[PDB]
Amino acid sequence: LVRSLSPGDIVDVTGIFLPLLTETYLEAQFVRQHTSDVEERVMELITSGDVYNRLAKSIAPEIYGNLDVKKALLLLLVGGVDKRVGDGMKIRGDINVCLMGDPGVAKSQLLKAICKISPRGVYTTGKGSSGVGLTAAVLEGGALVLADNGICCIDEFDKMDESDRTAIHEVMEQQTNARTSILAAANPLYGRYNPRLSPLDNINLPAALLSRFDILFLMLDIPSRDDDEKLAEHVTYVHMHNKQPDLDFTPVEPSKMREYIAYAKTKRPVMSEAVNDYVVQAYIRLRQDSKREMDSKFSFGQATPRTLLGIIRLSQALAKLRLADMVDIDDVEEALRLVRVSKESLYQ
């Protein structure tokens, strides 16, 4: 029976429980370890339609209408497609999104929601817990190792120590295992944001780490009577009634949302030659014009192969979100749409 047990195994073991005080032990005798049903629900989801937006609308209806931001959460939850090219060279299948914004907007609730939705999500605030929260200790792995093949949500990312951020960069680059999708939330370095300054000036993080992100949405708590009137009515109804004021919409339950994501995870879309030329055409078109954006010094970052590969991962996610066997142009345009939408927050 030896070598039938290994550490970390959730097992059912039958044995003889054996021993004026007597210490006790057990001699093992037997060792064991621990779809049309869901397809009908998928058929109902297909019957309802609007799968791309229904899932995004279903993500935390108690949170204000950041639909384009929550769409990034849907693709991050789905994730991209890994590509072991060969010779040991690797391309990550994960999606990294940052959530910058002023305090008091309760943005951490979305971090709770996404971590709750994901079956392998790990939540973390500020610096690592007692230091051992990152890397491993004499080994007991940290949060990043715990979220392997999962999602890590971080609140107040900028306050992390250099050692804390050093381990972050390796995982963000090598995924070791610590295969994770990183969702970060951070308050402005000055307490309150200044749009007149560059995002790097208003945050502790440098460009070396931000360039590793896919989508870098910024939240500006701009005082506006028009927008705040809807948000206040939205929130005050959430407290009054156990559902969002948009009762016309029926959200998808988290188990079904999780199941479809798992169903999506099985698929593998592949690029066609038609979209292949479209991707390089859009990349060249966007990269050349993005030179003016960086020259204006009023944009988050210059167009680099981060944009080309970022769209590829997002297009793969969108195609895999649609359960498509191959990637189509509309996924690329939608991916390009969301990327361009993220820049709009800087111009409020």
Binding site: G88, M89, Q174, L200, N276, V279, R287, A303, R306
Partner: protein
């Protein structure tokens, strides 16, 4: 019982000892060595145990011997003495036999087939012969152990000689003399006994974790710290700690592979193929392919090391982490480190004394663990100043000297360093001098052999060239050959610089010297890279072509042609009037030389060598019918 039969096994080995050959390769192996062993004044033989798998019946013995190694070796000891006696006096070839006959011998098989690894062994595999490999770390001092006990009778001074059998001390009860018979009169004298050396050597074992080895007699102090080791001994765990009673220690492909190597060695696109095949994910970058590759080839080591080191000063969006992460895998196993996540202790070591061993012990850091190999240091611009101070002695003597409280010693960390460093700020700024774009002091920046300035330009044409390469690669030479090539090149080729190649270095270095930061550090690169190019060429001497190409590589890596000699700034673009005049003057002279010779025309190959000591200029003349 015992699988070993006393007479059967000695007869089986006797047939092997007189009839073995490998398949001039036809000569018998030990028919020659038997005379050499009788010549030797040695006391033991390191048996070529790979012969056991090279012969049929010997492998059958190995499986039988897997559980009874001691008995055969003890028989072989007497066999060796009998073989010596028979060859000396029975064959009448020698007469010096007295010391050999009285003394004792041993035999040590050194290349037995390896077992299923350490952690895969089983409780019944204990006491079985095994073969393992690993790295030695620490050594205990000489520990003597009892072999003979000396007893003197405390009332009559009679002396007895008592020897230990199977680790048992037997105290005599009475004096053995007829008259003196007092009970318990025998007493032990500590310093009249006989002892044998026992040493514990610590090995970092990699199965086919660290295991504390054990050695005895002449095997002690033969293994010292840092030795590369293969183990032929006995796995042991006794009432339970895991340890190996080392019987012998080793202090350290097909001809079809040679044919495969020569094909790549002969083909003209060798350098082009290597760049095309080393990194499929990275597009083009011919010089960067040549750069890191020359780091892996390395220069020659003489006593002066060939540890080529490279700094990637590229823009912070060019795939360079995609390289060094890949380099850590393809290269012979090294260490992947980040300057941000490393410290002086993390790179070098932590050294402390030991109560038991009474000599210094080392906890090897990242840098030392890469001894003799290749290491990658990402985030080199973010390394701490104290840690950066270590590299000065590392990149000048490959040693590290420590003198602190209670510890004064020097180490060795011979290794190659691959460094990548982002420019100061969010992007490279060519409006500033290059030495101001790099956050490294001149003393440290000068000692690197190669610095590469990889810049990304926003060009629509070049974007499509890169984009279509990657976009179709993720639809739907091998690493085994590449590692086989590099290991072959490092194994054999030790090129020597020729006289012609030597003299050209003087003009090459002086030319950079008069344009001044051309310290003598860059002159090290003018030989280190030269040897590594010949090693790739597999030419056993360094050619002048290797010299000039390496100089060009240094020029191209630093981009001297695109750098302002006044302020060190870089040209963004890197039809002109100087191009016009050179073409005009060239065309004027071609029209004369083509007709000055006593012919209406001549071969263009000879014409080029006549004036260069051109095709466009003559094509234009052909368009004008001249």
């Amino acid at each position: 019982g015992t699988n070993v039969s006393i007479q059967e096994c000695t007869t089986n080995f006797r047939n092997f000892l007189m009839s073995f050959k490998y398949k001039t390769d036809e000569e018998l192996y030990y028919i020659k060595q038997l005379n050499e062993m009788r010549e030797l004044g040695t006391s033991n033989l390191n048996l070529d145990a790979r012969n056991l798998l090279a012969y049929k019946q010997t492998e059958d013995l190995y499986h039988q011997l897997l559980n009874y190694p001691q008995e055969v070796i003890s028989i072989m000891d007497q066999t060796i003495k009998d073989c010596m006696v028979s060859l000396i006096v029975d064959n009448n070839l020698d007469y010096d036999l007295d010391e050999i006959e009285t003394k004792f011998y041993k035999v040590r098989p050194y290349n037995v087939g390896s077992c299923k690894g350490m952690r895969e062994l089983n409780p019944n595999d204990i006491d079985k012969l095994i073969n393992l490999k690993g790295l030695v770390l620490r050594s205990t001092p000489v520990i003597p152990d009892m072999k003979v006990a000396f007893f003197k009778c405390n009332v009559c001074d009679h002396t007895m000689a008592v020897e230990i059998d199977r680790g048992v001390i037997q105290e005599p009860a009475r004096c053995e003399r007829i008259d003196c018979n007092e009970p318990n009169s025998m007493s032990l004298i500590h310093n009249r006994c006989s002892f044998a050396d026992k040493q514990v050597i610590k090995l970092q074992e990699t199965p086919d974790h660290s295991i504390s080895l054990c050695v005895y007699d002449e095997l002690v102090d033969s293994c010292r710290a840092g030795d590369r080791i293969e183990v032929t001994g006995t796995f042991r765990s006794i009432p339970y700690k895991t340890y190996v009673d080392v019987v012998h220690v080793k202090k350290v492909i097909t001809d079809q592979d040679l044919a495969k190597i020569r094909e790549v060695a002969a083909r003209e696109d060798l350098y082009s193929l290597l760049a095309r095949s080393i990194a499929p994910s990275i597009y083009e970058l011919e010089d960067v392919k040549k750069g890191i590759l020359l780091q892996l080839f390395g220069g020659t080591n003489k006593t002066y090391r060939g540890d080529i080191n490279i700094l990637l000063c590229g823009d912070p969006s060019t795939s360079k982490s995609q390289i060094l992460q890949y380099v850590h895998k393809i290269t012979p196993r090294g260490v992947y480190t980040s300057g941000k996540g490393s410290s002086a202790v993390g790179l070098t070591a932590y050294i402390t004394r030991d109560v038991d061993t009474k000599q210094l012990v080392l906890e090897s850091g990242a840098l030392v663990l890469s001894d003799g190999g290749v290491c990658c240091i990402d985030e080199f611009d973010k390394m701490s100043d104290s840690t950066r101070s270590v590299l000065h002695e590392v990149m000048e003597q490959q040693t590290i000297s420590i003198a602190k409280a209670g510890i004064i010693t020097t180490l060795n960390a011979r290794s190659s360093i691959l460094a990548s460093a982002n420019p100061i700020g969010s992007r490279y700024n060519p409006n500033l001098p290059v030495t101001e774009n790099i956050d490294l002091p001149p003393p440290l920046l000068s000692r690197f052999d190669l610095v590469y300035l990889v810049l990304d330009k926003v060009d629509e044409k070049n974007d499509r060239e890169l984009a279509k390469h990657l976009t179709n690669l993720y639809l739907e030479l091998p690493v085994e050959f590449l590692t086989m090539y590099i290991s072959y090149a490092k194994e054999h080729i030790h090129p020597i610089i020729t006289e012609a190649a030597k003299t050209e270095l003087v003009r090459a270095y002086v030319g950079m010297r008069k344009m001044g930061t051309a310290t003598t550090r860059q002159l090290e690169s003018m030989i280190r890279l030269a040897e590594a190019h010949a090693k790739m060429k597999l030419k056993n001497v360094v050619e002048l072509e290797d010299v000039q190409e390496a100089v060009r590589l240094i020029r191209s890596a630093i981009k001297d042609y695109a750098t302002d000699p006044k302020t060190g700034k870089i040209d963004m673009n890197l039809k002109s009037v100087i191009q016009r005049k050179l073409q005009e003057d060239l065309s004027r002279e071609i029209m004369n030389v083509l007709k000055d010779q006593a012919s209406d025309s001549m071969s263009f190959n000879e014409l080029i060598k006549q004036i260069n000591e051109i095709q466009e200029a003559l094509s234009r003349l052909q368009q004008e019918d001249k």
